[PDB]
Write an enzyme that holds these catalytic residues in place. Structure first.
Site, PDB file in Angstrom:
ATOM      1  CE1 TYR A  23      -4.651   7.856   2.893  1.00 31.09           C
ATOM      2  CE2 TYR A  23      -5.208   7.841   0.575  1.00 31.09           C
ATOM      3  CZ  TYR A  23      -5.134   7.187   1.798  1.00 31.09           C
ATOM      4  OH  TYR A  23      -5.513   5.885   1.904  1.00 31.09           O
TER       5      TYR A  23
ATOM      6  CG  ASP B 248      -2.050   0.963   1.187  1.00 31.62           C
ATOM      7  OD1 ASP B 248      -2.951   0.885   0.311  1.00 31.62           O
ATOM      8  OD2 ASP B 248      -1.895   1.965   1.955  1.00 31.62           O
TER       9      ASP B 248
ATOM     10  CG  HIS C 178      -6.193  -2.915   0.333  1.00 31.06           C
ATOM     11  ND1 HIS C 178      -5.343  -2.451  -0.651  1.00 31.06           N
ATOM     12  CD2 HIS C 178      -5.861  -2.337   1.491  1.00 31.06           C
ATOM     13  CE1 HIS C 178      -4.514  -1.601  -0.043  1.00 31.06           C
ATOM     14  NE2 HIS C 178      -4.797  -1.490   1.230  1.00 31.06           N
TER      15      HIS C 178
END
Ligand SMILES: Cc1ccc(S(=O)(=O)N2C[C@H]3CN(C(=O)NCc4ccc(Cl)cc4Cl)C[C@H]3C2)cc1
Length: 322
Positions: free
Chosen positions: A241, A110, A299
């Site tokens: 982010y 990730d 995921h």
């Protein structure tokens, strides 16, 4: 199909390196042999690697499993720009320096996969070999703003929701148990759509108030994550982010160079965000790339299919990192 051995936090060796006056990174360490540095994603922990750490140590590696900056016992400064990839990668270089490691193998998942790609790209002399779970290597495109690119893939809508400081934090911190039980699910058990988060006004607005436990995790495991996120909360994690423009500009400074070290890309069939097809054509940038693929895997790769992950990583380490 018995689960690999896991880790009991109180039974681990805990290490702390101060990379800068206000930034100390925590890790757990197990095993002898060549150094392998495991780098988790969002919103995870060193403990996301609980099934890999014993297996890799048994296989003859010295495992360093990080709390990434913003997480767990690592420092979590509030400033957004503390979490841009340039800063985070330079801190990992300093981390190796303080430990007296000329190189390490870097394995990421990730956002930790993005980091280890950039380590390989910009600091290959410090990276013995690199592996990523789920996260592809995507070359910088100086003709498209990062904003453009996001808006052009609808499953990435939650990423806009995460931009404004404070908003997603409030939602994710409201009930930590609900946060982790809602997120850490097999693909078939999903309660969340990563689309139209903004129109809904949040990740969980249309999910159960009292979600069931995924088959992938126990209550005790969920409560470990809860306790960890009580330390600093979600601001640092979300700040990963909030550096899209800065990260893009840094990535453009790779002047089309390749990654020439041994590399492994592992795709997960049922990750509907970081889809396998995003990895297509990575060989154009990475001449020594090897691949793995895990069927029936979402995921949360390390806990969904720990046995398969372990088999893939150990086979690759033994052939290409040693
Ligand atoms: C230059 C560049 C390189 C790689 C990418 S990416 O691979 O598209 N990706 C990698 C990061 C991981 N990530 C993310 O949101 N992870 C959390 C998450 C995921 C899936 C589910 Cl189901 C739940 C959760 Cl909470 C977005 C970030 C963008 C983009 C751009």
């Amino acid at each position: 199909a018995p689960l690999p051995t896991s880790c009991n936090p109180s039974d681990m060796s805990h290490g702390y390196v101060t990379v800068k006056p206000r930034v100390r990174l925590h890790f757990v360490e197990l095993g002898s042999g060549p150094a392998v540095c495991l780098c988790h994603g969002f919103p995870e922990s060193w403990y996301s690697w609980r099934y890999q750490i014993p297996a890799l140590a048994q296989a003859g590696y010295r495992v360093l499993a990080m709390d990434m900056k913003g997480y767990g016992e690592s420092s979590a400064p509030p400033e957004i720009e503390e979490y841009c990839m340039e800063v985070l990668c330079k801190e990992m270089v300093t981390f190796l320096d303080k430990l007296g490691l000329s190189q390490a193998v870097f394995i990421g998942h990730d956002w930790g996969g993005m980091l280890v790609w950039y380590m390989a790209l910009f600091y290959p002399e410090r990276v013995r070999a690199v592996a990523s779970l789920n996260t592809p290597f995507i070359p910088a495109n100086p003709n498209m703003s990062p904003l453009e690119s996001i808006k052009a893939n609808p499953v990435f809508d939650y990423q806009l929701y995460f931009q404004e400081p404070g908003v997603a934090e409030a939602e994710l911190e409201q009930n930590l148990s609900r946060t982790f039980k809602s997120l850490f699910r097999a693909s078939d058990e999903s309660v969340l759509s990563m689309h139209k988060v903004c129109e809904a006004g949040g990740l969980f607005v249309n999910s159960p108030e009292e979600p069931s436990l995924s088959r992938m995790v126990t209550e005790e495991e969920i409560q470990f994550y809860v306790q960890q996120f009580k330390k600093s909360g979600f601001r640092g994690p979300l700040n990963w982010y909030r550096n899209m423009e800065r990260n893009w500009k840094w990535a453009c400074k790779s002047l089309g160079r390749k990654i020439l070290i041994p590399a492994l890309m592992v795709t997960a069939e049922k990750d509907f965000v970081l889809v396998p097809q995003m990895s297509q054509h990575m060989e154009d940038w990475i001449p020594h790339l090897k691949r793995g693929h895990i069927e029936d895997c979402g995921h949360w790769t390390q806990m969904d299919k720990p046995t398969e992950v372990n088999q893939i990583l150990i086979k690759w380490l033994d052939s290409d990192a040693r």
